[PDB]
Amino acid sequence: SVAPTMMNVLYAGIDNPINIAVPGVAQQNVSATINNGTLTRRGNLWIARPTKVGSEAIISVTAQSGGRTIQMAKTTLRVRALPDPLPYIEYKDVQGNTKRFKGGRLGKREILAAGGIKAALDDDLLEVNYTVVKFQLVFYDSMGNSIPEVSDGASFSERQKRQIQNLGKGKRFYVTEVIARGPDGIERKIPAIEVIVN
Amino acid sequence: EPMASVAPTMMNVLYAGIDNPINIAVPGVAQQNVSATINNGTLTRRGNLWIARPTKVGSEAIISVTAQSGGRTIQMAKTTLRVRALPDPLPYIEYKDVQGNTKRFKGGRLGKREILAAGGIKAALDDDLLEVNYTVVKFQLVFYDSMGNSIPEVSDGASFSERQKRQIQNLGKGKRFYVTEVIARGPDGIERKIPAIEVIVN
Amino acid sequence: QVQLVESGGGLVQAGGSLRLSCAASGRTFSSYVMGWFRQAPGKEREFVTAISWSGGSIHYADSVKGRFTISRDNAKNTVYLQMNSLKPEDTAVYTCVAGFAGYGSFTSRSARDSDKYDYWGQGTKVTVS
Amino acid sequence: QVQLVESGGGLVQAGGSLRLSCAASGRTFSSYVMGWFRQAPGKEREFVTAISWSGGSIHYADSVKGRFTISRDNAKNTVYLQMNSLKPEDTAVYTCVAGFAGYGSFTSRSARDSDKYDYWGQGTKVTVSS
């Protein structure tokens, strides 16, 4: 068994696949339970879905050997909040392909067609969807004054749309004060992105 | 009493450029008889423990385990672990409060004196708490003049350039600027572009 | 630079109710997590409650859960603490807090951490007889 | 959108050297990871090399490592490919790329991913004679 030591972590509100193994014991002979949320067998793995952030989850394991159930040592794991996501603008290119804008230049038509802001981890793992609760767009007038405009949930408000519509090529605005929520039930403030109108 | 291996698959990975302690165990075999090699970096022993320090991100690491007690040379399996890049850090401004305590500005309002005394930008995992050190390679500050034009100003590595300092010095209370194009480097040897932060002058 | 000023403190009988208010200066109230801490004589400072930027997430200390309620009014730059079923153990100086202006999550653990709040009020005395 | 135009391609003898150049339009060159892909007749497109925003990190295909060098000149909005010890297997159309304008890491895996680059050049033909 070759196991990285810092691995007793589960994320709340998502499926956590766990490899539970007993040396020399076939998968079907291994049975496992959890004291926090659910632990479901799926193929050669056990899927943990814990519920409260900052709590501990104890996994109890039994192995069948002939006509006897052997109790294994219990394992304690830390239930953590999910990592915080990053904002992006989901748009469709001229070929109709879905793309994620993560900073730099973007056309006015693409911004408006997106209709709002999204938030996700910038990584293949985990299998997680986050929601944008609210955000602000900060625009700059000819006098160099900042004009913060409040959203309509994850969607652009009518005031935001009008401000975007009157922006010329090379003009910039900022996606700020982005509040995101995850399936762990946690609300987080995430960083800004600059949008340069192309 | 008997030991079951309980390993979350999302956590059963190696990270390039850091200490990766690995518990390598053979049932009924004392720590002193276990011997291990790796095809990505080093695998040195810290007593009962094994520390893997892989170098190539994305390449799989092969852990060969051998022991001498039985026949001639007992060959174990032969495990493979994924070598991942470290997570990407977030920018911050490290400043000292009036009581001399070190603080991390992560957005919102900050005094001009605190910004200038910081002298530049830093990058770290928010978590944090210690744990991995990242470096700011370069960044831009975007200011807005009296004509409403955006003025992007290039840094001097992790430090503010003289042009950036002059722009910060002439900002009035409530004026805003943006830390953008932040390039950060980690001990995994990876360079990453990280998100922006808004700075409101206090 | 945000300044917090509490009001509504005073003497109340056990089983009674009292509403505390905390007005924040400036025009950035919506960018903060707002909360309350309390300090009783000869006791450690205790976290009472905190409310997220949006109001969608609230954390309460176990000792006040189901008895105290927090709410925010962004239009008035005010956070409120409604205390009900007041006990002599609720006698303390109540201090309003504001923090979490930058990026980061609002967990039970971070809500309870006094170091997560840059802005602290004046404190208001609540005496439960 | 950024336009990329390559130059310097042509015929070269085996063992020889050749430098390709790729000029980018606009004033945002420094915000991109710059690179090269190549396409030989009857072969899959191959990643060649890419250089990070700062120039401090570079990824090379195993087949070109120690033979090809990439460099960038932000002042000239130009990325260069210095090819040395050229082999007949290096015969291909070389296309300059620009990407990674948004947040994200520059790893060997992402450098090799054609989807990570929004801007592609015109291609330049390099012929290595035996």
Numbering used by the authors:
A (entry chain A): 319 to 516
B (entry chain B): 315 to 516
C (entry chain I), D (entry chain J): 1 to 52, 52A, 53 to 82, 82A, 82B, 82C, 83 to 100, 100A, ...
Show me the paper's own sentences about this structure.
We cloned a PorMp fragment between residues 224–516, co-crystallized it with nb130, and determined the structure of the complex. The D4 domain was easily traced in the electron density map because it was stabilized by nb130 binding, and it was introduced into the PorMp224 structure, generating a complete model.
PorL and PorM (GldL and GldM) are IM proteins that interact via their trans-membrane segments. Here, we present the atomic structures of the periplasmic domains of both PorM and GldM, that exhibit 22% amino-acid identity, and provide information regarding the contribution of each domain for interaction with PorK and PorN.
